[PDB]
From a paper:
Aberrant regulation of the PI3K/AKT pathway is implicated in the pathogenesis of several human cancers and inhibitors for multiple targets in this pathway are in clinical trials for the treatment of cancer. Comprehensive and elegant experimentation revealed substantial differences in the relative positions of the PH and kinase domains of inactive and membrane-associated AKT, resulting in the inactive form being termed the closed or ‘PH-in’ conformation; whereas the membrane-associated form is referred to as the open or ‘PH-out’ conformation.
We were able to co-crystallize ΔHM-AKT1(1–443) with Inhibitor VIII and to solve its structure to 2.7 Å resolution. The PH domain nestles between the N- and C-lobes of the kinase domain with Inhibitor VIII binding to all three regions. The superimposed structures show the PH domain fills part of the space occupied by the αC-helix and phosphorylated activation loop in the activated AKT kinase domain structures; thereby sterically preventing the kinase domain from attaining an active conformation. We were pleased to observe a ring-stacking interaction between Inhibitor VIII and Trp 80 as an alanine mutation of this residue in AKT1 has been shown to render Inhibitor VIII inactive. Ser 205 has the only direct hydrogen bond to Inhibitor VIII. We did not observe Glu 17 binding to the inhibitor in the co-crystal structure, however Glu 17 forms a salt bridge with the positively charged kinase residue Arg 273 almost certainly providing additional stabilization to the closed ‘PH-in’ conformation.
Author numbering: 2 to 45, 49 to 88, 92 to 113, 145 to 188, 199 to 298, 313 to 429
Write the structure that this text describes.
Amino acid sequence: SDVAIVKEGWLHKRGEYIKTWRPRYFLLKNDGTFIGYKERPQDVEAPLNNFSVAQCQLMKTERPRPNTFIIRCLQWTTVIERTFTPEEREEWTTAIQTVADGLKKQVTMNEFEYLKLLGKGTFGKVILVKEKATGRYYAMKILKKEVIVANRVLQNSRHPFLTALKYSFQTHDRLCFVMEYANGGELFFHLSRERVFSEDRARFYGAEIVSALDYLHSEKNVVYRDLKLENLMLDKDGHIKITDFGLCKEPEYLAPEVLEDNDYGRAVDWWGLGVVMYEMMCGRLPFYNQDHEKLFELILMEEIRFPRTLGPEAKSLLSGLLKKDPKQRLGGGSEDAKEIMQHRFFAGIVWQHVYEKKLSPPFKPQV
Ligand SMILES: O=c1[nH]c2ccccc2n1C1CCN(Cc2ccc(-c3nc4cc5[nH]cnc5cc4nc3-c3ccccc3)cc2)CC1
């Protein structure tokens, strides 16, 4: 199957973490691809599902400026949205919706029992529910369907280190997603009590993250982009479970190309591997400051310092993961997760073993 450009041109994309207005050249193809570039590209390669406008609908508004439209897609279980003379704004938003709809062409609210509120966001709330039929618990992501809409594909998407989506059902006004719940708390906790983690213990959590990210990259062709210490829970045995609770805005964990609103890919995930792993092995964020203009400046501009404790392999790995330039960042190459798996700091490891959970958990949750 081949595809052509439905429409293209310059667009003003609005920064999410730096809310300047930015010029980007976009092109929509009839695979669903909607991608913006730093400048008018040449050959015009398998893009990520992130840049696909499937299951979307648009919008128009004159704030902060008069010519503006908005897209809101339901990616997996999350709702994402992006903010971009007035005549075009009714042809662009014509084509995008066309392809979106063209691309679309191809358990009830209570077996569950409310337990507590896990969190709330612009687009909804996350709930703990006991299954009244089973007893074992779940998290339930409840999105308001009128922000967007105003398949058991979820058995393929099983990975030992990702929280599983077990049920998704709709009702009168809400979109519900029932994902599994890990018992053993999240790292942010256990790292506070421990202050820092050995390289061995950091190699355990990093390895399981890499397995999960490899899986999302190769199999699902999506970047996760939200890798942060607080998004890592443990199951009852102490193994990783990466959470999926995005309700709107989740910065210290985002890569330069993301805060700048440039082209990004699988590399933003490895950057975050860098930050999460640096944070484990050092006790501190690599880039922090109470002031946000300083925070962004550190991440984009400044070098990273290593405590003297750190072995040569551990810092070769962190330096590479935390390169500012994506095409130079360890993992940003064509082989992706493999060049991480093959770095010397992970020497000896056979990765089918990590998948199978043959690795010894440094920390057993009391559950
Ligand atoms: O980019 C953005 N612009 C935004 C603008 C506003 C708000 C939020 C935005 N975001 C986020 C959107 C969500 N971003 C996190 C995430 C990534 C992948 C899966 C994800 N996608 C899948 C697809 C599949 N298609 C077929 N099978 C699939 C399985 C998937 N499994 C899993 C997943 C599940 C559990 C843990 C981790 C990933 C989930 C969450 C973080 C950024």
